[PDB]
Amino acid sequence: RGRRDDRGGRGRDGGDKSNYIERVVSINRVSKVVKGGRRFSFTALVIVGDGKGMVGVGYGKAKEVPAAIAKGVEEARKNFFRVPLIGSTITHPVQGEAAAGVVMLRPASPGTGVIAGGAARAVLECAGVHDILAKSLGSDNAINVVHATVAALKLLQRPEEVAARRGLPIEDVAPAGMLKARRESEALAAAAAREGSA
Amino acid sequence: GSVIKKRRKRMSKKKHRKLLRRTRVQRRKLGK
Amino acid sequence: PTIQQLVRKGRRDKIAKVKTAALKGSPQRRGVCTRVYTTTPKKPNSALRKVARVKLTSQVEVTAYIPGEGHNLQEHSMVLVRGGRVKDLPGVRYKIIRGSLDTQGVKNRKQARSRYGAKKEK
Amino acid sequence: MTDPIADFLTRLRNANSAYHDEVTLPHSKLKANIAEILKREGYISDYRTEDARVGKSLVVQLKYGPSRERSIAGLRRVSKPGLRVYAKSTNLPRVLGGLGVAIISTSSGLLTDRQAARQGVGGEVLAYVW
Amino acid sequence: GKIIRTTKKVKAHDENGEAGIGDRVSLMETRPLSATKRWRLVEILEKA
RNA sequence: AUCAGCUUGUUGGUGGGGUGAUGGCCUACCAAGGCGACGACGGGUAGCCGGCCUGAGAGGGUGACCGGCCACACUGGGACUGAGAUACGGCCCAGACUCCUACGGGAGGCAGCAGUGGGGAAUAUUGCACAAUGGGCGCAAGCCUGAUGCAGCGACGCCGCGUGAGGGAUGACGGCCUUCGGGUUGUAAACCUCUUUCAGCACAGACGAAGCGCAAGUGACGGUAUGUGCAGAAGAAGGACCGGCCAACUACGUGCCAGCAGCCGCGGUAAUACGUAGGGUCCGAGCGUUGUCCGGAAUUACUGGGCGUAAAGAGCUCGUAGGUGGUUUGUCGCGUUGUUCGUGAAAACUCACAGCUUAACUGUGGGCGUGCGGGCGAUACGGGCAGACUAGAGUACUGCAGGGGAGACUGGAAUUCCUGGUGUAGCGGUGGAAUGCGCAGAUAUCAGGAGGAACACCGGUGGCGAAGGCGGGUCUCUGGGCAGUAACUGACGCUGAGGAGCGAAAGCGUGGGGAGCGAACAGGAUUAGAUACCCUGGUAGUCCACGCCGUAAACGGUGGGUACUAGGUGUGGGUUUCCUUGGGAUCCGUGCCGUAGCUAACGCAUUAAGUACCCCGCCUGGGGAGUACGGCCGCAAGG
RNA sequence: UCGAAGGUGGGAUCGGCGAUUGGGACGAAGUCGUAACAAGGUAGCCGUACCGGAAGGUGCGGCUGGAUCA
């Protein structure tokens, strides 16, 4: 990924809507032996997302690096994924496993900061979280820890969803501090939203 | 798995057996 | 595993794995140097490495490496051996301090300057 | 047969994982109290106690959602024989951030984590379900 | 956290020989009555 | 436990003795215990703690300062004095050492504060005061105090401040790159105002003392801290690093050299990795290196790991301690839990506040002190005791299947030899041959005899056994399994550290037996050469009796038990409902395919590698090495 | 009576050195072969025994982590 700063007198750079947040995690040239030598190709693990908390995971195969990055962008574009939150935190401590990828995603009080390793830091920095506390146990990789983090975010659910599963009136599903954090986060959603209307 | 591990182990074992052939006598008498 | 099996006996750490046997848990030891011969490393790295084997005060017989361009030390110099690591010659894991009790600092060394012991230009 | 309740919750994880409608069990007192707690929190739908070969039996129907999806998202026996886990009042261990619940058998009977918090008594855990 | 069952072979003092093997005796701490006989037993509960 | 037994004042009793006090503390007698796989007795190392460091915590490391206990005072014994003794600057004795001696005999004791030598990578002055606080004696004054208070020394640590500020160009001199245009150093510099902490020189000069004192004075630190003045940018910056991780790049110089490096790895005349230069980055009175510890390391996994093939399931069972325990009524309150009392010194730690120009620092008030003991309460769960139950477990009864085992007797086909026929020159063997047996009568064929071993066909993805393993037949003795009824007992269950037993083949001992096969051992051939394959011969062995040994890819590479989790189709054992042998249902077994789920993947998949509980074994990078040393078993090989 | 040191005695146990010797690790490159990986040119491996300059070879039983398919 070099020589991107450019000014063209051509038709268009085609800049348009959906200015999302896009992170390229790792690139390892992938070789293939054929008759008389090696054929080098490229893999780019592409994370895309918006600051609401919708995450994509794309996996680009091409024999050029920006081609593989662009194919990962289109593949994560094809496949988004909804993550439920509280304010800008996570709901409750989970462990995700993608066959060797263990990631523990635990919430924290706000202000602490996204503390995670670089793959999980990528998937969570694209997402709508600002203050959680994760760790990547096992598998020491990028692909399995990204995919394990997304499986960990599939083990998430709303407080309300849990209440619904059990047919119980909330209050009765959460404890009270987390309901107060719901009041804080929806209150600042009201403040920034009504400042957004004017 | 592979048989290479098995064969390294067995090389050690063989060498040792031989070493006890040749020193058999000597170990008996030097020990007695 | 089967927690009563850990109540019986289990779960101890492995081994301290001591790095240097200079002695005493001491950072550098002065030493009488003998036979300052120059050696040949492993196969991807071919050169002549300027080692000297040193009898540390701690009574042990070791073999240290002399960093820098040349060594002021001849037979029977009082060199101050610290512990290091040189991959390249097997069994030599100690480095002689340059700019010390006997072995003078490296001359015209102008950039590295703390290692190799070169004093500042007047 | 070494742990009764592990076979109970084990049979609920298997019958929950394999999309079953009901499940049948050897009835006992402690399984009746756990079945009554999982009634009162709504993780199971309802249980009925039959007479059968020699003893009574516990037939639990499981509560599913708007399609085939499950309400009990897991069980885990923690106060297991061999490491029976005890809990003072300071912390009735919170489960799944509070969204899960903790079946805690205090001196007043069998309670949940929240009931062990407000009523001011602790003294066990048992399995906690989310 | 394993609740370990442990034993303790204390030594104890019967003046009247009221206890025998297998009994459920009480105990109470005393002055050091000899070299490790630091217990005397009152109100023996059950005999064998 | 590569240390399994130790102990004879040793274990208890009585009478004395001793002590401030209980007591094998001591003694006489009597009794003969006591302590140990919850590790006794031995070996190694070590002062212990409040704490400190690290860590999300759990934990790991450590025991410097400060504080609390303990032990010792040249080495080793002993008492005396005294309210109280390891009696550091006491005594007595014996040692080792230093010293004085008129040679008769004496003297010493820095592990007090300084200080010297030595050892060492390394650790300070032979300081000043009792003004303050503590201590002693004294009616008091007062005297003593290397405790203490302070000072000196070392960037040894932690914190604070300084080495100037503001202006200043289409950006000078110089430097080094360059695409030869220029670009960087660089607003930085020179210059122009301004301000001076801190060092400098002046003069003033403390608090610490609501103190002591009956004397009139008294502060070691100290003319220090600190004030108010004067002069002037005036006296004040360095060290590492710039391949990757990991903020930061260019040229020149050497071109597998000289060197670098924490790991990966850089040097073979165009190195952003070596050396020098510019330039950048990061820190800053410091900055790098080495050592030691925690972290990252979920890499000893309680929290928080594993064992089909990656390291890892004992060859297989039986069973001692141990761990663990179905249904249900009562009782106890040992585990658990609630509450209150006591305690966890101070300091530290954390929160707030106050004090020093700020901070480090210090103080005040909370919390912490995760614990332990006493009182009172609760009884679900665990446990104890006392009971009850029949589903687990075992027994009885009726059957049923089977190379389960041992002993005994016996059967035929085939190979070899033997005697006798019939009968001739080849047979045997090979990729092709030759050693070899023959021509003395072989191989071939017929009749008879000996002797040994193995059991064609049935017989296979089939049966039985715990695992090894088990197939000619019959008889004798004996072991287990399965189903059916439910007659009995009433939780008697599960696992099982050590332990005993069984355990292919090879091998070992003593005595038999010895047909075939056959290591070793010959010859032949092949080959460069065969100490090999292939050929001809061939001893131990293979066989039986009696014992050893204890190993295997002893493999399902899968410890044992239990409950549950879509199915489909074979086959083995047995019960029953229906058609009337055919299907159904059921309990036990063994295969092939297959969902869910699981796995690193292959795969597994109701006979789990799925979901859970109980107990055991075992793993912690590869070699070194299942080896040395030591012990145990063994006739030895060896385990 | 007890009793420190001293003396005599025979042992335990921890080490240091020892001529010679066994193996082990590394070295580049030397000599000798070619055992293993493809049916590796005789399928490989386990146990054990015997033999051989060496890798190894053979026997007895086992195993697929074996092959092509009579």
PDB file of N, CA, C and O (backbone and C1' of nucleotides) in Angstrom, chain C residues 1 4 8 13 27 45-46 49 69 82-83 85 87 109-116, chain F residues 239-241 257-260 263-265 267 275-276 289-290 300 302 305-306 497 616:
ATOM      1  N   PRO C   1      -6.142 -31.123  37.744  1.00  0.00           N
ATOM      2  CA  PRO C   1      -6.987 -32.192  37.217  1.00  0.00           C
ATOM      3  C   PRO C   1      -7.536 -33.052  38.336  1.00  0.00           C
ATOM      4  O   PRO C   1      -6.715 -33.668  39.004  1.00  0.00           O
ATOM      5  N   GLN C   4      -8.699 -33.129  43.941  1.00  0.00           N
ATOM      6  CA  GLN C   4      -8.062 -33.888  45.014  1.00  0.00           C
ATOM      7  C   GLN C   4      -6.699 -34.419  44.582  1.00  0.00           C
ATOM      8  O   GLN C   4      -5.810 -34.609  45.415  1.00  0.00           O
ATOM      9  N   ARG C   8      -3.338 -33.821  46.734  1.00  0.00           N
ATOM     10  CA  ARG C   8      -2.284 -34.797  46.996  1.00  0.00           C
ATOM     11  C   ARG C   8      -0.910 -34.233  46.652  1.00  0.00           C
ATOM     12  O   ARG C   8      -0.104 -33.966  47.548  1.00  0.00           O
ATOM     13  N   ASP C  13       6.233 -25.082  39.791  1.00  0.00           N
ATOM     14  CA  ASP C  13       6.902 -24.475  38.650  1.00  0.00           C
ATOM     15  C   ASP C  13       8.092 -25.331  38.227  1.00  0.00           C
ATOM     16  O   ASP C  13       8.455 -26.302  38.894  1.00  0.00           O
ATOM     17  N   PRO C  27      27.192  -8.873  38.570  1.00  0.00           N
ATOM     18  CA  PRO C  27      27.018  -8.410  37.184  1.00  0.00           C
ATOM     19  C   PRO C  27      28.267  -8.471  36.325  1.00  0.00           C
ATOM     20  O   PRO C  27      28.169  -8.799  35.139  1.00  0.00           O
ATOM     21  N   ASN C  45      27.655 -17.751   8.981  1.00  0.00           N
ATOM     22  CA  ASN C  45      28.430 -16.596   9.410  1.00  0.00           C
ATOM     23  C   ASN C  45      29.896 -16.997   9.484  1.00  0.00           C
ATOM     24  O   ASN C  45      30.339 -17.528  10.502  1.00  0.00           O
ATOM     25  N   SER C  46      30.654 -16.701   8.437  1.00  0.00           N
ATOM     26  CA  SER C  46      32.060 -17.067   8.392  1.00  0.00           C
ATOM     27  C   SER C  46      32.925 -15.826   8.533  1.00  0.00           C
ATOM     28  O   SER C  46      32.823 -14.892   7.733  1.00  0.00           O
ATOM     29  N   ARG C  49      36.475 -14.535  14.902  1.00  0.00           N
ATOM     30  CA  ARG C  49      36.008 -13.826  16.084  1.00  0.00           C
ATOM     31  C   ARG C  49      37.094 -13.800  17.149  1.00  0.00           C
ATOM     32  O   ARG C  49      37.690 -14.831  17.473  1.00  0.00           O
ATOM     33  N   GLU C  69      37.215  -3.283  17.652  1.00  0.00           N
ATOM     34  CA  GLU C  69      38.059  -3.528  16.486  1.00  0.00           C
ATOM     35  C   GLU C  69      39.330  -4.289  16.844  1.00  0.00           C
ATOM     36  O   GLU C  69      39.777  -5.149  16.078  1.00  0.00           O
ATOM     37  N   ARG C  82      31.965  -8.841  31.782  1.00  0.00           N
ATOM     38  CA  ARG C  82      30.541  -8.853  32.062  1.00  0.00           C
ATOM     39  C   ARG C  82      29.902  -9.992  31.288  1.00  0.00           C
ATOM     40  O   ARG C  82      30.551 -10.648  30.471  1.00  0.00           O
ATOM     41  N   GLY C  83      28.625 -10.247  31.571  1.00  0.00           N
ATOM     42  CA  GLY C  83      27.890 -11.294  30.902  1.00  0.00           C
ATOM     43  C   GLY C  83      27.105 -10.735  29.737  1.00  0.00           C
ATOM     44  O   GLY C  83      26.445  -9.713  29.862  1.00  0.00           O
ATOM     45  N   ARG C  85      25.729 -12.028  25.425  1.00  0.00           N
ATOM     46  CA  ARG C  85      25.388 -13.175  24.594  1.00  0.00           C
ATOM     47  C   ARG C  85      25.857 -12.951  23.171  1.00  0.00           C
ATOM     48  O   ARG C  85      25.408 -12.016  22.501  1.00  0.00           O
ATOM     49  N   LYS C  87      25.695 -15.173  19.821  1.00  0.00           N
ATOM     50  CA  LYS C  87      25.135 -16.392  19.243  1.00  0.00           C
ATOM     51  C   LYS C  87      26.191 -17.186  18.503  1.00  0.00           C
ATOM     52  O   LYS C  87      26.117 -18.418  18.414  1.00  0.00           O
ATOM     53  N   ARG C 109      36.760   5.603  18.147  1.00  0.00           N
ATOM     54  CA  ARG C 109      35.330   5.349  18.286  1.00  0.00           C
ATOM     55  C   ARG C 109      34.656   6.683  18.586  1.00  0.00           C
ATOM     56  O   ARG C 109      34.918   7.338  19.598  1.00  0.00           O
ATOM     57  N   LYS C 110      33.791   7.112  17.673  1.00  0.00           N
ATOM     58  CA  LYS C 110      33.208   8.441  17.777  1.00  0.00           C
ATOM     59  C   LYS C 110      31.686   8.446  17.782  1.00  0.00           C
ATOM     60  O   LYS C 110      31.092   9.501  18.017  1.00  0.00           O
ATOM     61  N   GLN C 111      31.035   7.310  17.551  1.00  0.00           N
ATOM     62  CA  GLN C 111      29.583   7.302  17.443  1.00  0.00           C
ATOM     63  C   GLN C 111      28.902   6.374  18.441  1.00  0.00           C
ATOM     64  O   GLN C 111      27.875   6.744  19.016  1.00  0.00           O
ATOM     65  N   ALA C 112      29.449   5.173  18.663  1.00  0.00           N
ATOM     66  CA  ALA C 112      28.833   4.246  19.612  1.00  0.00           C
ATOM     67  C   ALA C 112      28.954   4.759  21.040  1.00  0.00           C
ATOM     68  O   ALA C 112      27.944   4.885  21.736  1.00  0.00           O
ATOM     69  N   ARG C 113      30.189   4.980  21.504  1.00  0.00           N
ATOM     70  CA  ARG C 113      30.611   5.940  22.528  1.00  0.00           C
ATOM     71  C   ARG C 113      30.365   5.654  24.010  1.00  0.00           C
ATOM     72  O   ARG C 113      30.946   6.350  24.844  1.00  0.00           O
ATOM     73  N   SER C 114      29.558   4.657  24.384  1.00  0.00           N
ATOM     74  CA  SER C 114      29.465   4.302  25.803  1.00  0.00           C
ATOM     75  C   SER C 114      29.970   2.898  26.020  1.00  0.00           C
ATOM     76  O   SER C 114      30.862   2.661  26.840  1.00  0.00           O
ATOM     77  N   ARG C 115      29.399   1.951  25.289  1.00  0.00           N
ATOM     78  CA  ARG C 115      30.129   0.761  24.914  1.00  0.00           C
ATOM     79  C   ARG C 115      31.353   1.175  24.111  1.00  0.00           C
ATOM     80  O   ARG C 115      31.358   2.229  23.465  1.00  0.00           O
ATOM     81  N   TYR C 116      32.410   0.356  24.228  1.00  0.00           N
ATOM     82  CA  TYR C 116      33.737   0.480  23.620  1.00  0.00           C
ATOM     83  C   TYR C 116      34.575   1.564  24.301  1.00  0.00           C
ATOM     84  O   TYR C 116      35.756   1.723  23.982  1.00  0.00           O
TER      85      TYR C 116
ATOM     86  P     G F 239      27.826  13.110  25.288  1.00  0.00           P
ATOM     87  O5'   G F 239      26.729  12.025  25.675  1.00  0.00           O
ATOM     88  C5'   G F 239      26.979  11.059  26.684  1.00  0.00           C
ATOM     89  C4'   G F 239      25.899  10.007  26.689  1.00  0.00           C
ATOM     90  C3'   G F 239      25.659   9.322  25.356  1.00  0.00           C
ATOM     91  O3'   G F 239      26.546   8.233  25.177  1.00  0.00           O
ATOM     92  C1'   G F 239      23.590  10.016  26.291  1.00  0.00           C
ATOM     93  P     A F 240      26.370   7.240  23.933  1.00  0.00           P
ATOM     94  O5'   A F 240      25.350   6.151  24.473  1.00  0.00           O
ATOM     95  C5'   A F 240      24.846   5.142  23.613  1.00  0.00           C
ATOM     96  C4'   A F 240      23.348   5.034  23.697  1.00  0.00           C
ATOM     97  C3'   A F 240      22.670   4.766  22.385  1.00  0.00           C
ATOM     98  O3'   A F 240      22.779   3.412  22.020  1.00  0.00           O
ATOM     99  C1'   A F 240      21.493   6.454  23.537  1.00  0.00           C
ATOM    100  P     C F 241      23.621   3.047  20.710  1.00  0.00           P
ATOM    101  O5'   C F 241      22.514   3.022  19.559  1.00  0.00           O
ATOM    102  C5'   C F 241      21.391   2.155  19.646  1.00  0.00           C
ATOM    103  C4'   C F 241      20.089   2.887  19.436  1.00  0.00           C
ATOM    104  C3'   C F 241      19.684   3.173  18.000  1.00  0.00           C
ATOM    105  O3'   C F 241      19.133   2.043  17.319  1.00  0.00           O
ATOM    106  C1'   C F 241      19.356   5.104  19.322  1.00  0.00           C
ATOM    107  P     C F 257      35.756 -13.682   4.726  1.00  0.00           P
ATOM    108  O5'   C F 257      35.985 -12.187   5.240  1.00  0.00           O
ATOM    109  C5'   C F 257      36.718 -11.927   6.429  1.00  0.00           C
ATOM    110  C4'   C F 257      37.497 -10.653   6.300  1.00  0.00           C
ATOM    111  C3'   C F 257      37.624  -9.804   7.549  1.00  0.00           C
ATOM    112  O3'   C F 257      38.649 -10.280   8.417  1.00  0.00           O
ATOM    113  C1'   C F 257      37.210  -8.445   5.623  1.00  0.00           C
ATOM    114  P     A F 258      38.429 -10.342  10.010  1.00  0.00           P
ATOM    115  O5'   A F 258      38.201  -8.824  10.426  1.00  0.00           O
ATOM    116  C5'   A F 258      39.289  -7.919  10.465  1.00  0.00           C
ATOM    117  C4'   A F 258      38.808  -6.495  10.565  1.00  0.00           C
ATOM    118  C3'   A F 258      37.830  -6.195  11.691  1.00  0.00           C
ATOM    119  O3'   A F 258      38.438  -6.070  12.971  1.00  0.00           O
ATOM    120  C1'   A F 258      37.011  -5.259   9.691  1.00  0.00           C
ATOM    121  P     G F 259      37.850  -6.890  14.231  1.00  0.00           P
ATOM    122  O5'   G F 259      36.731  -5.919  14.833  1.00  0.00           O
ATOM    123  C5'   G F 259      35.383  -6.333  15.019  1.00  0.00           C
ATOM    124  C4'   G F 259      34.420  -5.348  14.396  1.00  0.00           C
ATOM    125  C3'   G F 259      32.962  -5.455  14.822  1.00  0.00           C
ATOM    126  O3'   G F 259      32.662  -4.816  16.050  1.00  0.00           O
ATOM    127  C1'   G F 259      33.055  -5.445  12.484  1.00  0.00           C
ATOM    128  P     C F 260      31.756  -5.579  17.134  1.00  0.00           P
ATOM    129  O5'   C F 260      30.274  -5.478  16.554  1.00  0.00           O
ATOM    130  C5'   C F 260      29.637  -4.221  16.379  1.00  0.00           C
ATOM    131  C4'   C F 260      28.341  -4.351  15.610  1.00  0.00           C
ATOM    132  C3'   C F 260      27.166  -4.998  16.324  1.00  0.00           C
ATOM    133  O3'   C F 260      26.499  -4.116  17.204  1.00  0.00           O
ATOM    134  C1'   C F 260      27.342  -5.887  14.149  1.00  0.00           C
ATOM    135  P     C F 263      20.016 -13.034  21.230  1.00  0.00           P
ATOM    136  O5'   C F 263      18.801 -14.050  21.012  1.00  0.00           O
ATOM    137  C5'   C F 263      18.587 -14.696  19.765  1.00  0.00           C
ATOM    138  C4'   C F 263      17.159 -14.550  19.280  1.00  0.00           C
ATOM    139  C3'   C F 263      16.994 -14.541  17.768  1.00  0.00           C
ATOM    140  O3'   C F 263      16.926 -15.849  17.234  1.00  0.00           O
ATOM    141  C1'   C F 263      15.789 -12.730  18.707  1.00  0.00           C
ATOM    142  P     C F 264      17.904 -16.277  16.039  1.00  0.00           P
ATOM    143  O5'   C F 264      17.180 -15.681  14.755  1.00  0.00           O
ATOM    144  C5'   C F 264      15.868 -16.103  14.433  1.00  0.00           C
ATOM    145  C4'   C F 264      15.132 -15.102  13.577  1.00  0.00           C
ATOM    146  C3'   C F 264      15.789 -14.720  12.266  1.00  0.00           C
ATOM    147  O3'   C F 264      15.631 -15.704  11.257  1.00  0.00           O
ATOM    148  C1'   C F 264      14.978 -12.778  13.347  1.00  0.00           C
ATOM    149  P     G F 265      16.889 -16.607  10.804  1.00  0.00           P
ATOM    150  O5'   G F 265      18.085 -15.558  10.621  1.00  0.00           O
ATOM    151  C5'   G F 265      18.253 -14.794   9.424  1.00  0.00           C
ATOM    152  C4'   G F 265      18.316 -13.302   9.702  1.00  0.00           C
ATOM    153  C3'   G F 265      19.267 -12.484   8.836  1.00  0.00           C
ATOM    154  O3'   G F 265      18.763 -12.175   7.549  1.00  0.00           O
ATOM    155  C1'   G F 265      19.629 -11.927  11.090  1.00  0.00           C
ATOM    156  P     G F 267      23.611  -7.952   3.658  1.00  0.00           P
ATOM    157  O5'   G F 267      24.857  -8.648   4.356  1.00  0.00           O
ATOM    158  C5'   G F 267      26.069  -8.841   3.655  1.00  0.00           C
ATOM    159  C4'   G F 267      27.137  -7.878   4.110  1.00  0.00           C
ATOM    160  C3'   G F 267      28.477  -8.017   3.403  1.00  0.00           C
ATOM    161  O3'   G F 267      28.525  -7.320   2.163  1.00  0.00           O
ATOM    162  C1'   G F 267      28.798  -7.863   5.757  1.00  0.00           C
ATOM    163  P     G F 275      29.610   0.014  14.034  1.00  0.00           P
ATOM    164  O5'   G F 275      30.644   1.066  13.432  1.00  0.00           O
ATOM    165  C5'   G F 275      32.018   1.020  13.792  1.00  0.00           C
ATOM    166  C4'   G F 275      32.858   1.930  12.934  1.00  0.00           C
ATOM    167  C3'   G F 275      32.448   3.395  12.914  1.00  0.00           C
ATOM    168  O3'   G F 275      32.931   4.130  14.021  1.00  0.00           O
ATOM    169  C1'   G F 275      32.825   2.647  10.704  1.00  0.00           C
ATOM    170  P     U F 276      32.142   5.443  14.514  1.00  0.00           P
ATOM    171  O5'   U F 276      32.327   6.499  13.333  1.00  0.00           O
ATOM    172  C5'   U F 276      33.563   7.170  13.130  1.00  0.00           C
ATOM    173  C4'   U F 276      33.483   8.171  12.004  1.00  0.00           C
ATOM    174  C3'   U F 276      32.377   9.208  12.098  1.00  0.00           C
ATOM    175  O3'   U F 276      32.659  10.266  12.994  1.00  0.00           O
ATOM    176  C1'   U F 276      32.478   8.357   9.894  1.00  0.00           C
ATOM    177  P     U F 289      20.415  -0.426  27.077  1.00  0.00           P
ATOM    178  O5'   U F 289      21.747  -1.063  27.678  1.00  0.00           O
ATOM    179  C5'   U F 289      22.783  -1.495  26.815  1.00  0.00           C
ATOM    180  C4'   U F 289      23.990  -1.983  27.578  1.00  0.00           C
ATOM    181  C3'   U F 289      23.782  -3.185  28.491  1.00  0.00           C
ATOM    182  O3'   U F 289      23.819  -4.417  27.780  1.00  0.00           O
ATOM    183  C1'   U F 289      25.045  -1.519  29.610  1.00  0.00           C
ATOM    184  P     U F 290      22.929  -5.681  28.243  1.00  0.00           P
ATOM    185  O5'   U F 290      23.594  -6.127  29.610  1.00  0.00           O
ATOM    186  C5'   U F 290      24.860  -6.753  29.591  1.00  0.00           C
ATOM    187  C4'   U F 290      25.389  -6.970  30.978  1.00  0.00           C
ATOM    188  C3'   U F 290      24.492  -7.733  31.928  1.00  0.00           C
ATOM    189  O3'   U F 290      24.539  -9.136  31.725  1.00  0.00           O
ATOM    190  C1'   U F 290      25.334  -5.816  33.000  1.00  0.00           C
ATOM    191  P     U F 300       3.229 -21.662  33.806  1.00  0.00           P
ATOM    192  O5'   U F 300       1.841 -22.140  34.414  1.00  0.00           O
ATOM    193  C5'   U F 300       1.447 -23.488  34.304  1.00  0.00           C
ATOM    194  C4'   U F 300       1.054 -24.078  35.628  1.00  0.00           C
ATOM    195  C3'   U F 300       1.735 -23.478  36.854  1.00  0.00           C
ATOM    196  O3'   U F 300       0.900 -23.623  38.011  1.00  0.00           O
ATOM    197  C1'   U F 300       2.386 -25.728  36.600  1.00  0.00           C
ATOM    198  P     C F 302      -5.004 -25.220  38.560  1.00  0.00           P
ATOM    199  O5'   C F 302      -5.834 -24.626  39.792  1.00  0.00           O
ATOM    200  C5'   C F 302      -6.903 -25.349  40.393  1.00  0.00           C
ATOM    201  C4'   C F 302      -7.818 -24.446  41.195  1.00  0.00           C
ATOM    202  C3'   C F 302      -8.527 -23.349  40.417  1.00  0.00           C
ATOM    203  O3'   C F 302      -9.685 -23.817  39.762  1.00  0.00           O
ATOM    204  C1'   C F 302      -7.600 -22.443  42.398  1.00  0.00           C
ATOM    205  P     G F 305      -9.105 -24.315  33.203  1.00  0.00           P
ATOM    206  O5'   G F 305      -8.118 -24.830  32.060  1.00  0.00           O
ATOM    207  C5'   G F 305      -7.693 -23.948  31.029  1.00  0.00           C
ATOM    208  C4'   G F 305      -6.531 -24.505  30.239  1.00  0.00           C
ATOM    209  C3'   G F 305      -6.761 -25.817  29.535  1.00  0.00           C
ATOM    210  O3'   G F 305      -7.560 -25.684  28.377  1.00  0.00           O
ATOM    211  C1'   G F 305      -4.605 -25.796  30.496  1.00  0.00           C
ATOM    212  P     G F 306      -8.477 -26.915  27.906  1.00  0.00           P
ATOM    213  O5'   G F 306      -7.456 -27.869  27.127  1.00  0.00           O
ATOM    214  C5'   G F 306      -7.431 -29.280  27.341  1.00  0.00           C
ATOM    215  C4'   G F 306      -6.033 -29.827  27.181  1.00  0.00           C
ATOM    216  C3'   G F 306      -5.897 -31.329  26.978  1.00  0.00           C
ATOM    217  O3'   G F 306      -6.094 -31.719  25.626  1.00  0.00           O
ATOM    218  C1'   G F 306      -4.357 -30.608  28.612  1.00  0.00           C
ATOM    219  P     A F 497      -4.030 -47.625  42.281  1.00  0.00           P
ATOM    220  O5'   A F 497      -3.142 -46.532  43.010  1.00  0.00           O
ATOM    221  C5'   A F 497      -3.138 -45.202  42.515  1.00  0.00           C
ATOM    222  C4'   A F 497      -2.253 -44.317  43.335  1.00  0.00           C
ATOM    223  C3'   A F 497      -0.915 -44.925  43.717  1.00  0.00           C
ATOM    224  O3'   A F 497       0.041 -44.827  42.673  1.00  0.00           O
ATOM    225  C1'   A F 497      -1.912 -43.926  45.608  1.00  0.00           C
ATOM    226  P     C F 616      -8.125 -39.167  42.912  1.00  0.00           P
ATOM    227  O5'   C F 616      -7.482 -40.162  41.881  1.00  0.00           O
ATOM    228  C5'   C F 616      -6.896 -41.323  42.404  1.00  0.00           C
ATOM    229  C4'   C F 616      -6.487 -42.265  41.333  1.00  0.00           C
ATOM    230  C3'   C F 616      -5.325 -41.825  40.501  1.00  0.00           C
ATOM    231  O3'   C F 616      -4.090 -42.011  41.167  1.00  0.00           O
ATOM    232  C1'   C F 616      -6.998 -42.692  39.129  1.00  0.00           C
TER     233        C F 616
END
